[PDB]
């Protein structure tokens, strides 16, 4: 069913998420990505409406699939004896945000604003559909270079959204909030907002602000590049030590630094083409 329906191209990469290949759907030459995960390497399992036992990423990707382009679309999936295989959308040309920032260094604020705004819209969409990503970072964001549209990827560390405390975490440590480091406890929205402050810092400074646990706990933000006061303030707000002092998604998008955002296509014409 899958071996014949998709033509397998080169390996795009591999890691904690499994192995992802470039590929093409034979019926219409639609570009795709083919993601393989071994059953033994999945800790977090979930359950579909009908009760089949699948990797959580499949539950979460199904809950967020719709016309909205901010989250990578799950096109199909398959069970094999020892693995799951996910077929996912692939923009062409595409570049992940980690490589994009590596190549350019610190991004101009106008570009960081457009990118960050699109990440916010996408995270809001996930939260509305009951999904917490738990691994928001540059490596998990793709840029559709022609259209200037960002997409969230890798829901393999995700969870169903809930209002009670989380005591498990399997995302990236340096994007994880101080309450996780000190107490192994966090709540969904406020932890997500912390990762977003790390992401925004990363965009405007060209690197993440904290390496060591002690720096995270201390939460002192030092700017290594010229960054406007408004952007610094928003960043420091997202990285408040107390979870309850962090802004809501709404407060982030109504922040003065976030006004007059470019459209995705305007963003591509000025900054990407
Ligand atoms: N960890 C990951 N989980 N899903 C991934 C994913 C999903 C759908 C995708 N469509 C296109 C890509 C893609 C395109 C170009 C580079 C790229 N790099 C990823 C970085 C880890 C390996 C793949 N991914 C893609 C990646 S990467």
Swiss-Prot record:
The modified positions for Phosphoserine read 66, 229
Positions of ATP binding: 12-20, 35, 89, 96
Its needed co-factors are: Mg(2+)
As annotated in Swiss-Prot or TrEMBL, what is the tissue specificity of this protein?
A: Expressed primarily in cells of the hematopoietic and germline lineages. Isoform 1 and isoform 2 are both expressed in prostate cancer cell lines.
The reported effect of residue 161 to F is:
Decreased kinase activity
Kindly indicate whether the keyword Nucleus belongs to this entry. yes
Protein kinase domain residues are: 6-258
* UniProt EC number: 2.7.11.1
Among InterPro entries, the record links this protein to: Kinase-like_dom_sf, PIM1/2/3, PIM_Ser/Thr_kinase, Prot_kinase_dom, Protein_kinase_ATP_BS, Ser/Thr_kinase_AS
Q: How does it assemble?
A: Interacts with RP9. Interacts with HSP90AA1, this interaction stabilizes PIM1 protein levels. Interacts (ubiquitinated form) with HSP70 and promotes its proteasomal degradation. (Microbial infection) Interacts with Epstein-Barr virus EBNA6; this interaction upregulates and stabilizes PIM1 and induces cell proliferation by inhibiting the growth suppressive properties of p21.
Name the chain's protein: Serine/threonine-protein kinase pim-1
- Source organism per UniProt: Homo sapiens (Human)
């Amino acid at each position: 069913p899958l071996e014949s329906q998709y033509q397998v191209g080169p390996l795009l990469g591999s890691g904690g998420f499994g192995s992802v290949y470039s590929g093409i759907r034979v019926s219409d030459n639609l570009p795709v990505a083919i993601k393989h995960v071994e059953k033994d390497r999945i800790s977090d399992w979930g359950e579909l409406p009908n009760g089949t036992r699948v990797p959580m990423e499949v539950v979460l990707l199904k809950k967020v699939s719709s016309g909205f382009s901010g989250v990578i679309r799950l096109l199909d999936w398959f069970e094999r004896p020892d693995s799951f295989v996910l077929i996912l959308e692939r923009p062409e040309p595409v570049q992940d945000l980690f490589d994009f920032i590596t190549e350019r260094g610190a991004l101009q604020e106008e570009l960081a604003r457009s990118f960050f705004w699109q990440v916010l819209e996408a995270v809001r969409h996930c939260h509305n559909c009951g999904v917490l990503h738990r691994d928001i970072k540059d490596e998990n964001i793709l840029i559709d270079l022609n259209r200037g549209e960002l997409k969230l990827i890798d829901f393999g560390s995700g969870a169903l959204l809930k209002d009670t405390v989380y005591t498990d975490f399997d995302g990236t440590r340096v994007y994880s909030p101080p309450e996780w480091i000190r107490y192994h406890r966090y709540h969904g929205r406020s932890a997500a907002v912390w990762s977003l402050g790390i992401l925004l810092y990363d965009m405007v400074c060209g690197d993440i602000p904290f390496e060591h646990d002690e720096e995270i706990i201390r939460g002192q933000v030092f700017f290594r590049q010229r960054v406007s006061s408004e952007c610094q303030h928003l960043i420091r707000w997202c990285l408040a030590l107390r979870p309850s002092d962090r802004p809501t998604f709404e407060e982030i998008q109504n922040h003065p630094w976030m006004q007059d955002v470019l459209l995705p296509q305007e963003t591509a014409e000025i900054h990407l083409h």
